[PDB]
Amino acid sequence: MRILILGLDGAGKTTILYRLQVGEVVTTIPTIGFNVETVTYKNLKFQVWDLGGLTSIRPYWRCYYSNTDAVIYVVDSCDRDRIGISKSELVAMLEEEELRKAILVVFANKQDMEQAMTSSEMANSLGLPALKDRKWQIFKTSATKGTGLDEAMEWLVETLKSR
């Protein structure tokens, strides 16, 4: 199974990847390229690609779409100004024929902060209730504390197991 972790720079992608791999917070630098690790959940192996989200390299995301079973889309819940950007990147990517059948899980990350938007605002801003022909769910996560990850991953795995 092949998973892409996408989202704007600073959203917490790389921090999520190593939290999923080794249950700990790791120090990161901006990812100018990608990280790839295989992760083991409920006796099952996923190849997870963490793609850098900086402005200049976002356009290259589509190069990696072939044979993608799921996208983990990570969104900084405190970043109200750029949720519009995340939504336009999400609309653009879900028009791609290669992701026709991909499962979409949205991680509303940095929910440990008081400044966090709620799961509900975010779904509306991202246009998620309007999405058709798509299996999707949104989850509240903090990559630093660890909350919400085990439960989002339970959902992704079971959804993938069912086609």
Binding site: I32, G33, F34, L54, S56, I57, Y60, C63, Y64, S66
Partner: protein
């Protein structure tokens, strides 16, 4: 400051030249470097013809 495409390409080209995920890396390289569409077609056709 070096264009950030250089750091990006170092990672992509290392993988490609070591034979790792070559079809993906070839798409990325041809995109990052803005090859004319006809050269891209030629490169990706040859990549597909690499026998396992």
């Amino acid at each position: 400051g070096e264009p950030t495409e250089f750091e990006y390409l170092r990672k992509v080209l290392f993988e490609y030249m070591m034979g790792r995920e070559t079809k993906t890396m070839a798409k990325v390289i041809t995109t990052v470097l803005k090859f004319p569409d006809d050269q891209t077609q030629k490169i990706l056709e040859r990549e597909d013809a690499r026998l396992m």
